[PDB]
């Protein structure tokens, strides 16, 4: 779960 | 290089345990190795949510071939210290400026 990674 | 904000090889759960300390001001942070991808790093920072309380946002820091690191490809850096220095003065993508080194 990273804010800058959508997928 | 001994920067206080660099924790290296700690898990995500370990990083949230340190950041979710109630005494940390908003924007408390640390940089650590990615616990999922070899060669990648992460910037984990504290914030508060009315409904759920204290929270931690994680940003994947990609490390290039090549040298260099970045959260978003439009803003790149030669090193991890440069990256922290920058975001410590400008949110520029982050919800808030990196305010404080997370206590060990």
Curated annotation (Swiss-Prot), chain B:
Limits of the SH2 domain: 5-102
Top-level lineage group: Eukaryota
Post-translational modification summary for this protein: The phosphorylated form is termed pp60c-src. S-nitrosylation is important for activation of its kinase activity.
UniProt-annotated location(s): Cell membrane; Mitochondrion inner membrane; Endosome membrane; Nucleus
Tissues showing expression: Expressed to high levels, and with a high degree of kinase activity, in certain fully differentiated cells such as neurons, platelets and macrophages. Isoform 1 is widely expressed. Isoform 2 is expressed only in the muscle.
Transmembrane annotation, as ranges: none
Subunit structure, as described in the record: Forms a complex with polyoma virus middle T antigen. Interacts with AFAP-110. Interacts with GJA1 and PXN.
Family: Belongs to the protein kinase superfamily. Tyr protein kinase family. SRC subfamily.
Function description: Non-receptor protein tyrosine kinase which is activated following engagement of many different classes of cellular receptors including immune response receptors, integrins and other adhesion receptors, receptor protein tyrosine kinases, G protein-coupled receptors as well as cytokine receptors. Participates in signaling pathways that control a diverse spectrum of biological activities including gene transcription, immune response, cell adhesion, cell cycle progression, apoptosis, migration, and transformation.
Protein name as annotated: Proto-oncogene tyrosine-protein kinase Src
Taxonomic source organism: Gallus gallus
Covered residues, full protein: 145 to 247 of 533
């Amino acid at each position: 779960s990273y804010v800058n990674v959508q997928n | 290089m001994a920067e206080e904000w660099y924790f290296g090889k700690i898990t995500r759960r370990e990083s949230e345990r340190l950041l979710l300390n109630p005494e940390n001001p908003r924007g408390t942070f640390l940089v650590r190795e990615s616990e999922t991808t070899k060669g990648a790093y992460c910037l984990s920072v504290s914030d508060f949510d009315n409904a759920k309380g204290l929270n931690v946002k994680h940003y994947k820091i990609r490390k290039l071939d090549s040298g260099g690191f970045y959260i978003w490809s439009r803003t790149q850096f030669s090193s991890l210290q440069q990256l922290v220095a920058y975001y410590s003065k400008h949110a520029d993508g982050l919800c808030h400026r990196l305010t404080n080194v997370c206590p060990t």
